């Protein structure tokens, strides 16, 4: 069976890593008080 | 303090799940040619 030609490589550069982690950690720090309540 | 018993796991997964998603995508990008 022939492989699928719609496949594409995915990328996330390092700055995007740092931005995303910043986002996730700040949302965590923000919402943690509300989750503990 | 008498906090929500699920607040720790909710916070731990809210951190860890999208953080590992980003790490997975970062690491496999670096390993591309």
């Amino acid at each position: 069976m022939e492989p699928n030609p719609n496949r594409q490589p995915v990328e996330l550069n390092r700055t995007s890593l740092y931005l995303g982690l910043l986002l996730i950690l700040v949302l965590a720090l923000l919402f943690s008080s509300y989750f503990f309540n | 303090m008498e906090v929500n018993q699920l607040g720790l796991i909710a916070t731990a997964l809210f951190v860890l799940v999208p953080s590992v998603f980003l790490i997975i995508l970062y690491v496999q990008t670096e390993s591309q040619q």
Binding site: N13, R14, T15, Y18, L21, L22, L25, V26, A28, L29, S32, S33, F36 | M1, V3, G7, L8, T11, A12, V15
Partner: peptide, 30 residues
């Protein structure tokens, strides 16, 4: 647990500052 959780997340943010500053992708003029 709460206090540990808040300090942990905070400490990770400070670490992320360290990597974002000293281990950034270097701006390259091309």
């Amino acid at each position: 647990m709460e206090t540990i959780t808040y300090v942990f997340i905070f400490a990770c943010i400070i670490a992320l500052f360290f990597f974002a500053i000293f281990f950034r992708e270097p701006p390259r003029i091309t």
